[PDB]
Amino acid sequence: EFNVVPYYSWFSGITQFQKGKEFEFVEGQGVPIAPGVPATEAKGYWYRHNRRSFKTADGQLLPRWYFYYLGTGPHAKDQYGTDIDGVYWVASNQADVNTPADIVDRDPSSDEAIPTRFPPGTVLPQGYYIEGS
Numbered sequence: 001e002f003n004v005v006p007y008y009s010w011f012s013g014i015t016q017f018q019k020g021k022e023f024e025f026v027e028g029q030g031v032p033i034a035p036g037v038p039a040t041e042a043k044g045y046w047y048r049h050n051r052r053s054f055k056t057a058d059g060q061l062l063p064r065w066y067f068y069y070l071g072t073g074p075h076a077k078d079q080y081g082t083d084i085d086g087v088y089w090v091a092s093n094q095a096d097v098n099t100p101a102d103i104v105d106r107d108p109s110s111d112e113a114i115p116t117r118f119p120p121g122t123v124l125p126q127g128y129y130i131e132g133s
Ligand SMILES: Nc1ncnc2c1ncn2[C@@H]1O[C@H](COP(=O)(O)O)[C@@H](O)[C@H]1O
Pocket: 006, 007, 008, 009, 010, 011, 012, 013, 014, 049, 066, 112, 113, 114, 131, 132
């Protein structure tokens, strides 16, 4: 949850459930599927939301990552592929990463998030759960 309204991702998040496993994709992979989007526009980044829990007298949420098309979201101005903590860049090999994706953001009610799905052959990062799946 957010005490500051986030930029809305077109897609459901990917949640870490095993500590220690790194968030990664093979180069050319990792852009979630949206109907009608040309592969030339399949470029962007996953952004890590660190989550924080409140203290109890019991006994820790792990991060959840959200996808943003290139030139959108909280890192809209950062260059593709730049080392930034909490940003993981992904792109189809059809995409030119020197230009922002031609994709207006999501919301209001207008559209709900698309459950995150990847094409056959995608190496899925172990230790992460794709929300919606
Ligand atoms: N920065 C964000 N933080 C939390 N939720 C977001 C964010 N951007 C968009 N959303 C939408 O809120 C829902 C949470 O994602 P998920 O719970 O993993 O299914 C998703 O449908 C998101 O796309």
